[PDB]
Design a protein around this ligand. Structure first.
Ligand code: COA
Ligand code: OAA
Ligand code: CL
Ligand code: CL
Ligand code: CL
Ligand code: K
Ligand code: K
Ligand code: K
Lengths: 438, 432
């Protein structure tokens, strides 16, 4: 059967021609205004990214190439002996728009694992970094240190044509993906454990390799990581980490430098820590309520939180009008594996009463939980209790969506991202002339 | 006299109130349209950034707080015995909008040098990185490794008020700036020399300490570095490195992670790494008259490659940073062979690019002329040239980051769609 690169090589020229024809016929059509408040407000609401792999459906949640969470659960092949799709399978879908066969996924997993050996200088670098250097900083350092392996950078120096960029971008992306579970596990073992790490199983999948190297053989934990890494793999192109990766990549920096920059964006406390924020809030609630999770006790705690001017972390969507299907998938995992786990009972008790309380409070348009309201409790159950590592896991997942778009951008020859800026003094002059009309 | 931090603490509340009133009274005014071709064309022409220190005119080039490069050479204080501007003097102007006195610049240089000592774990990591790992990758690695020292990161975890973010951002920024010449010289000495490092002179300026740590006390080389680090320091808010640093910083990553990300964008061959690409392209042409130059330009274009150092996203005429560098060469070494080659290409390349018919700007940018000046003084290792660009551009990057935290600027987060969804959006727009 065709490999991922072979199938992509057949699909990308069709997409490239489609984009060229679309811009030729409709490029002059106005799709938005830019108001002054938007340039001073982080460009909120401005269409500013072409991102093929995922789009948020306001009724049905995130869609990956048109498929909801329920669709990917039904449609993607599963690991042998499991009901969880693999993140490798979703990566195939993100890049091609097509669902791979089980045999195609197995071959892709084997290709990734064949590329998983860290160069000696990266092992040495990681082993000697201080334990107080944050795991996300260690992560982006290690990814950047792989730039010496970059096939795109070496080929660009040899003078390849623009029409060939995508091929080397693809190879660098798979080389990088193959190493992410090893980098992440090495950081985990060095910072939080004894530094001792096993070896990659050449027949294991990406999530299984990650969990085994982190230090667990529990097949249910493997299944949890397959779920976690699938559902976090992509969420549009406007968010800081996806946008940063696209921007750096648009200057023809390699996938290593592009992903490292995206990871630094994900490391920002306003972007990649929602899981940890929920967990901290759950722990503080548990202490304050003295382990009492009854309806009356929880509702009073939620009313006091909202009445004091604070939000319920993980609840309330700007756009999505129902519970995130990624939340429901994690709830189902907990219901099927550990329904009596005390921390899950707290999460579930909140789910039963929070939407009603938020609705009556009247300050939350879409009073439903997101993926981050449920992820930490599942990680805690399997012993991954070190919350300062959670964004590393997020990056190991989101790298799939980031690299899929980076390959696509090189395949279509997307141009450098370079908007215009002005100072406040010059915006005042611009606005004065617009309002005066001359 | 007032320190930079003291003066900034007086001006930022006034800027904050000014922005708030401006957006309150004029926020609904439309300043641009977004056409489909712009979202599919890198957002070219979209006003998408607020950036105070510098504004780029397509015809006239860069202005720093309203001043051209020539204005900067006249208005800012210089080092003793020198006619070149100091980058730390421009940094003062970028952050405050005001020209520092000579004594204020000297005090700022001394503060930067007082913060220049690298932690042991950073020295050790640099000493152990392979010599074949590109210097820009080593540079962003070293900057990221300083995150363990971040005062902003520690204060944020301790729960400081949003109103106090700027103070820790400011301290991290000056801590980081003070270390950049040491990191850059360490990379140079390790990769190309014996790895041995001299000591920082507490009383020398930023560019002089960089050149001295690289190993040279040539006074004209020091003057070149003063000019180089000044003119590369900022190019408004929409260039890839500045924009990347703003984006990452807007999620409250520290100055270390924001700068490291900006450096990774600067490392792209369509961005700052074009200065290495230019030197390598010049040397390949030399190894291989108007006819021979024109043939080499066409052979490059016909191979599906860009002419490095020509074109620009915004500029539509010759870059004034190119002219400032030509002027330096005319005043110091007009007969230098590599300078004459760059000048000979300037006579031929714009015509070829115009006939080629693709670029919107057939004129050279800063990267066409920077490497040749470094070559004159014996800095022959072109894989180091973008590190120097990064040492400079950190000034403009960090000035805006401090300003952004002082005013509480928003997360940058536009909306994306797939091509399938853009088609639906366009169809509905055109039906109405
Ligand atoms: C700087 C640069 C990236 C700006 O990109 P841009 O805003 O999209 O430029 P344009 O609008 O003029 O691009 C239109 C076309 O002309 C081409 N072009 C632009 N500058 C070119 C150059 N110096 N050589 C060859 N082709 C060039 C572009 O690749 C593009 O081709 P395409 O339609 O097939 O995709 C571009 O000019 C470039 O690649 N320059 C060479 C690298 C360089 O010197 N970078 C330093 C910039 S300070
Ligand atoms: O302005 C740009 O887009 C690129 C450039 O010249 C710079 O950043 O110095
Ligand atoms: Cl996101
Ligand atoms: Cl975001
Ligand atoms: Cl208007
Ligand atoms: K080259
Ligand atoms: K963004
Ligand atoms: K940009």
């Amino acid at each position: 059967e065709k490999t991922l690169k072979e199938r992509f090589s057949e699909i990308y020229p069709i997409h490239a021609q489609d984009v060229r024809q679309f811009v030729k016929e409709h490029g002059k059509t106005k799709i938005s205004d830019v108001l002054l408040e938007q340039v001073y407000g982080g460009m909120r609401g401005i269409p500013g990214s072409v991102w093929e792999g995922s789009v948020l459906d306001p009724e049905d949640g995130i869609r990956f190439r048109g498929r909801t969470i329920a669709d990917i659960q039904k449609d993607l092949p599963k690991a042998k002996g499991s009901s969880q799709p693999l993140p490798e399978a979703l990566f195939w879908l993100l890049l091609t728009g097509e669902v791979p066969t089980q045999a195609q996924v197995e071959n892709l997993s084997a290709d990734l694992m064949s590329r998983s050996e860290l160069p000696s200088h990266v092992v040495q670098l990681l082993d000697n970094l201080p334990k107080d250097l944050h795991p996300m900083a260690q992560f982006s350092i290690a990814v950047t240190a792989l730039e010496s392996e970059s096939k795109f950078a070496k080929a660009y120096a040899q003078g390849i044509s623009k029409q060939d960029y995508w091929s080397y971008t693809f190879e660098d992306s798979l080389d990088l993906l193959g190493k992410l579970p090893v980098i992440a596990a090495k950081i985990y073992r060095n910072v939080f454990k004894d530094g001792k790490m096993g070896e990659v199983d050449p027949n294991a999948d990406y999530a299984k390799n990650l969990v085994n190297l982190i230090g667990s053989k529990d097949e249910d934990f493997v299944d949890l990581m397959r779920l976690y890494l699938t559902i976090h793999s992509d969420h549009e192109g406007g968010n800081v980490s996806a946008h940063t990766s696209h921007l750096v990549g648009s200057a023809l920096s390699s996938p290593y430098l592009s992903l490292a920059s995206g990871l630094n964006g994900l490391a920002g406390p306003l972007h990649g820590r929602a899981n940890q924020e929920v967990l901290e809030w759950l722990f503080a609630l548990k202490e304050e309520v003295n382990d009492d999770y009854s309806k009356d006790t929880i509702e009073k705690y939620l009313w006091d939180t909202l009445n004091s001017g604070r939000v319920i972390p993980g609840y309330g969507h700007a756009v999505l009008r129902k519970t995130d299907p990624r939340y429901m998938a994690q709830r189902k995992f907990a219901m099927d594996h550990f329904p009596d786990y005390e921390l899950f009972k707290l999460v579930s008790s909140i789910y039963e009463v929070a939407p009603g309380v938020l609705t009556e409070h009247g300050k939350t348009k879409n009073p439903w939980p997101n993926v981050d309201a449920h992820s930490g409790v599942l990680l805690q159950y399997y012993g991954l209790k070190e919350s300062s590592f959670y964004t590393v896991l997020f990056g190991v997942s989101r790298a799939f969506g980031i690299l899929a778009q980076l390959i696509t951008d090189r395949a279509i020859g997307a141009s450098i991202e370079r908007p215009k800026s002005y100072s406040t003094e010059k915006y005042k002059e611009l606005v004065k002339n617009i309002e005066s009309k001359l």
